[PDB]
């Protein structure tokens, strides 16, 4: 639709040189198409000539022995015009697609080298649509738009130089309609834009009212809001009625008006062509030729104006894609790992971090974990027990202080080794739309289907897995929507178990599980935590009791530490959190 404002690009030539860099490998093929477009566009301006000349040589002089020769010259010229259209058409089809195929390849490989940070900062939906739109937007131009712009320009100039050599006055009479076209086109194009957007505005509002009221219908009824909500819809709707009309009118008067100038042209060429013919100045067949140009200025001109606007727009898109392809990737230092075979000891030393550099989230966090000891991070949301997992998995780098495993800085150890030595289950892990077998294999690729049965058996997953339709090969479409959340957490645990990381940090939700699975879950936990260091999140009453160490966080700081019994008797903040949660003992 009507562009809002011309796109603001930065050094498009550079991005053009760069975009054309994807075209260099197949240059010969491009030149060929360009000449194909050339020859075919000319061949088409010749048609109205020959036909007019055939009227002049065969028909009027009445010599039909010549008819078969002209009618053979067309049957051949036409044949090529379309032979080329099909060539220049298909030649680009595989070319264009081959280009964006590369752009996609690059963009995706880029998606896995680019810091997790970018995924957290902006919503998933809009970064994908904006990227795929630019990728498509560049497809259109590179594949079709560009050639049709060049085709139409060779056609335009051709038909014009031709007309002038045949006749000047008649040429000037036909080109008389050009100013009319351009002027009308521009006036109608401003109204169409104005109301398009004015309508888009009112429509978006009305639409929003619809999406929210249907999504929150229950609430709307609970509060008896129908009358009020109906009126809210009404006032907007009645203004969409009035605007949508204007929007619908201007967007639709151009075709009739462009037609009108096409007929005004026909008339002129007819009323002067036939009046110069009567002065013997021009020939009749010449009129037929000029008639065949009277539709070569209205729309084909606009298509030139619009195809130009679509090419700029495409550059902007390219520019965006290029900037994304230039984002710095995550790279390990030359001297990092590999981590020696260890049991895994962690340590924080005056670590300061914050997603938003402005607002601090952690602050002077310093502690020490011992190989094999279960640890528990407790606190009220807004603490930092969550922001811990990331830093330790080096999804982010610490701003102050330092972290180390087995006595080696986390920033001086290849992320590859770190991620392999550390495991992670989250309150919100993510299953892939695949066979449960494949999901559980995502950790230790190459693990047999017999070893996985035993492994999945030790975490209380084997039972409900066979109890599924199609056993292990079952496809978990839409990321496990057809499973109970408990059963998913179980699977996530079984998966994490197969990676067998020396260090294992996990966060096990308990909000929406059935008591049955609940036992299966905590049982699987203990059989997942054994034999290795585990940093658990505090939701389980029975894990903060067996915790070799509890470390209470608050407002991004370590207020207390020590075992449960120590912390409750200390009358500490831990006591407050615990008694204001398990102060149910008043009953007993």
């Amino acid at each position: 639709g009507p562009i809002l404002e011309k796109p603001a690009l930065k050094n498009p030539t550079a991005t053009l040189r760069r975009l054309l860099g994807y075209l260099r490998p197949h240059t010969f093929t491009l030149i060929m198409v360009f000449v194909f477009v050339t020859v075919s566009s000319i061949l088409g301006v010749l048609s109205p000539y020959l036909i007019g000349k055939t009227i002049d040589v065969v028909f009027v002089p009445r010599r039909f022995d010549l008819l078969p020769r002209y009618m053979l010259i067309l049957g051949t010229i036409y044949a090529l015009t379309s032979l080329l259209f099909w060539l220049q058409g298909k030649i680009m089809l595989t070319l264009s697609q081959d280009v964006v195929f590369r752009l996609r390849k690059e963009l995706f490989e880029k998606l896995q080298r680019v810091p997790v940070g970018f995924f957290d900062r902006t919503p998933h939906g809009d970064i994908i649509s904006r990227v795929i739109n630019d990728v498509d937007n560049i497809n259109n131009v590179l594949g079709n738009s560009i050639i049709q712009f060049f085709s139409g320009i060779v056609t335009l100039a051709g038909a014009v130089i031709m007309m002038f050599r045949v006749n000047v006055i008649l040429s000037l009479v036909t080109l008389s309609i050009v100013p009319l076209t351009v002027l009308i086109t521009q006036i109608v194009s401003s109204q169409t834009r104005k109301y398009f957007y004015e309508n888009q505005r009112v429509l978006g509002q009305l639409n929003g009212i619809i999406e929210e009221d249907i999504s929150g219908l229950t609430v709307i009824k609970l509060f008896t809001r129908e009358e009020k909500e109906m009126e809210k819809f009404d006032r907007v709707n009645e203004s969409l009625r009035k605007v949508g009309t204007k929007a619908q009118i201007f967007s639709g008067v151009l075709p009739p008006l462009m037609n009108m100038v096409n007929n005004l042209g026909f008339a002129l060429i007819s009323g002067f062509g036939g009046w110069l013919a009567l002065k013997d100045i021009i020939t009749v067949g010449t009129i037929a030729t000029f008639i065949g140009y009277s539709r070569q200025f209205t729309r084909p001109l606009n298509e030139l104006s619009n195809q130009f606007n679509m090419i700029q727009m495409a550059l902007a898109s390219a520019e965006r894609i290029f900037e994304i392809l230039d984002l710095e990737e995550e790279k390990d230092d030359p001297d990092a790992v590999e981590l020696r075979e260890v049991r895994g000891e962690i340590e924080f030393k005056n670590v300061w971090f914050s997603y938003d550099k402005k607002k601090p989230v952690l602050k002077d966090i310093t502690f020490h974990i011992k190989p094999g000891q279960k640890v528990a991070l407790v606190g009220p949301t807004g603490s930092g027990k969550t922001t811990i997992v990331n830093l330790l998995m080096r999804f982010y780098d610490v701003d102050r202080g330092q972290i180390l495993v087995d006595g080696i800085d986390i920033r001086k150890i290849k992320r590859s080794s770190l991620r392999s030595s550390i495991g992670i289950v989250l309150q919100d892990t993510i299953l892939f739309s695949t066979t449960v077998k494949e999901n559980l294999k995502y950790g230790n690729p190459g693990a047999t289907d017999e070893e996985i049965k035993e492994a999945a058996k030790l975490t209380h997953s084997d039972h409900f897995i066979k109890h599924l339709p199609e056993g292990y090969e079952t496809v978990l479409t839409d990321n496990g929507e057809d499973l109970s959340q408990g059963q998913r957490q179980l699977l996530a645990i079984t998966r994490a178990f197969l990676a067998n990381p020396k260090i294992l940090i996990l966060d096990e939700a308990t909000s929406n599980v059935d008591t049955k699975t609940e036992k299966s879950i905590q049982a699987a936990m203990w059989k997942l935590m054994e034999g290795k260091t585990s940093i658990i999140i505090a939701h389980r009453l029975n894990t903060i009791k067996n915790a070799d160490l509890i470390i209470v966080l608050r407002d991004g700081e370590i207020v207390e530490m020590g075992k449960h019994d120590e912390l409750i008797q200390k009358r500490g903040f831990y006591y407050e959190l615990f008694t204001s949660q398990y102060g149910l003992v008043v009953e007993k």
Partner: protein
């Protein structure tokens, strides 16, 4: 039988517009079919007979027909704009009014996502379809039929060339539609698949990365990337072969006209000008015939929007207030269920069964149970959002089905498990239960709701802006905001379905304690899956597997309810 509702009624009120739209079209099509004939008249009766007046007058006459044709095409578009617009307006209104009346069991049929599209997209399609019916749907066919008519009138014999040109074109259209349709759908499969890989990689990126499986995910993406390239070349290669072949046929058409027309003029049967006018008509017939093709492709799709919209206009509300429903100027807060049984769908066994229990006004009951026990269902019966399949539900010893819905719903006040707010100010949201509520009264509620201090910290404060979804606020203050909204209503029954999930345990305790003193003479349900929160209530209703397992106190319940012990063991 589904329903006799029909969307032709939305156009009727504007029939006058619907009749001028196409009438103004003919005036154009005529003026468009006229041009090529007046050209033949210039050359075969002006130039050949050498009288300037003829050419001059029919030249001037061709100009007038161009302008009149202009007033034609415009008047059409103008009038069709009006008709199609009011059509959508009227259609959209009723469509919205329907949805507002829907019970939850109605929204159950059409998933909520489809409802939105039917009221937004489908409405525009139909709007366009009506726009289309009144312009090109009249245009193209009239140019096609009128074009053929003119050719036949110019010279019957030559028109036989049409009989040869039309069938192959029509045949081309059919072939493409029947070979390309499945190849375009095939593209749609390959595109979406590309998204599934791009979405999952953004979603579970930490998973992927942590498992050092990126390499596997590239190889996994390439597979979808190639499929897209492949699926597109195939489909679009057909397209890029059709267009040129179409242009060829119409071009050979010209040939056939100049060649066969050539003999007719030799045999002194056909003038030279009529040959020029024929070549034009020849084209009009063809291009129109191409437009007619495109129209058909759109119609079938448009038809699907008609069906979806009609289904909605034909659905009946599953909850209806009886004719002499009882007015409830007040309610005390008695709430009872007698042999209540409930299924959401016929295929599944009962979600609730043998539900018998009562509650006296002013009570504070906690409804406890594991996920999928029917707690929310059970509560949704009180405000008549759903009806029992078996048994009844009473409020103040009255059958809810028996009383006015505005009254009943007016005295009840629920805080839904999934919180939703609406566009406007926070203060507007909080007044949803009372328009005349004073500002102080709202501060009271928000204070109890432990949210007044969050609001007060906002630059705009109470006049602060609520995004369309309530997306700007997180779960916590959104959740708390509705508790405030719930309390401002001044309910005689207050349902709190997991209204703590998104707040700190410290904040939670304060709200509930604030209720005890503010829910003065208010029957209150605390729905939750945790024993700690259940213990704050005077008595505990326990649900397990859709049935009431035990109703009493921690002491009683611990000894009597195996589901209670089962829950107890799970948390301790």
């Amino acid at each position: 039988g589904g329903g006799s509702k029909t969307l032709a009624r939305y156009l009727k009120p504007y029939w006058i517009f619907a009749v001028l739209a196409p009438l103004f079209m003919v005036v154009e099509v005529i003026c468009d079919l006229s041009q090529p004939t007046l050209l033949a008249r210039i050359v075969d009766e002006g130039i050949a007979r050498g009288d300037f007046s003829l050419v001059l007058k029919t030249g001037i006459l061709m100009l007038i027909v161009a302008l009149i044709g202009a007033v034609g095409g415009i008047g059409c578009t103008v009038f069709a704009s009006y008709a199609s617009q009011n059509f959508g307006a009227d259609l959209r209104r009723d469509l919205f009014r329907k949805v507002l009346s829907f019970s939850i069991s109605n929204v159950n049929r059409f998933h909520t996502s489809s409802l939105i599209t039917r009221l937004t997209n489908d409405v525009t399609q139909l709007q366009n379809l009506v726009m289309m019916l009144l312009r090109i749907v009249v245009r193209a066919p009239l140019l096609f039929v009128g074009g053929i008519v003119m050719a036949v009138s110019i010279n019957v014999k030559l028109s036989s060339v049409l009989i040869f040109l039309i069938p192959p074109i029509v045949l081309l259209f059919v072939w493409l539609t029947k070979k390309g349709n499945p190849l375009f759908r095939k593209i749609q499969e390959s595109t979406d698949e590309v998204n599934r890989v791009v979405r999952e990689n953004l979603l579970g990126v930490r998973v992927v990365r942590a498992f050092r499986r990126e390499e596997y995910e590239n190889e996994n993406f390439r597979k979808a990337n190639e499929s897209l390239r492949r699926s597109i070349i195939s489909a679009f290669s057909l397209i890029v072969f059709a267009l040129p072949l179409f242009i060829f046929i119409v071009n050979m058409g010209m040939i056939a006209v100049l060649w066969f027309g050539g003999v007719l003029v030799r045999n002194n049967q056909m003038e030279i000008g009529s040959i020029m006018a024929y070549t034009n008509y020849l084209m009009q017939i063809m291009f129109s015939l191409m437009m007619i093709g495109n129209i058909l492709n759109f119609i079938v799709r448009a038809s699907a929007s008609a069906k979806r919209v009609l289904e909605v206009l034909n659905e009946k509300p599953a909850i209806e207030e009886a004719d002499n429903a009882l007015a409830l100027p007040n309610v005390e807060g008695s709430v009872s269920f007698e042999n209540v049984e409930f299924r959401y769908f016929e295929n599944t066994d009962p979600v609730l069964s043998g539900v018998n229990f009562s509650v006296k006004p002013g009570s504070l009951v906690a409804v406890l149970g594991e996920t999928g026990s029917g707690k929310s269902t059970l509560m949704n019966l009180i405000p008549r959002l759903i009806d029992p399949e078996r048994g009844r539900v009473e409020v103040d010893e009255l059958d809810v089905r028996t009383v006015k819905l505005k009254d009943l719903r007016g005295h009840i006040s629920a805080v839904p498990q999934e919180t939703v707010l609406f566009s406007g100010t926070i203060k507007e949201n909080l007044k949803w239960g009372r328009e005349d509520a004073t500002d102080d009264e709202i501060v009271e509620a928000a204070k109890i709701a432990q949210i007044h201090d969050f609001i007060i910290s906002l630059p705009e404060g109470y006049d602060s802006r609520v995004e369309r979804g309530g997306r700007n606020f997180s779960g916590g203050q959104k959740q708390r905001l509705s508790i405030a909204r719930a309390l401002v209503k001044k309910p005689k029954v207050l349902i709190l379905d997991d209204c703590t999930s998104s707040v700190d345990p410290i904040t939670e305790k304060r709200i509930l304690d604030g209720l005890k003193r503010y829910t003065k003479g208010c029957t209150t349900f605390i729905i939750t899956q945790k024993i700690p929160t259940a213990l704050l209530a005077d008595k505990i209703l326990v649900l397990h597997e859709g049935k009431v397992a035990g109703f009493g106190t921690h002491k009683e319940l611990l000894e009597h309810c195996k589901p209670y012990r089962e829950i107890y063991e799970s948390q301790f």
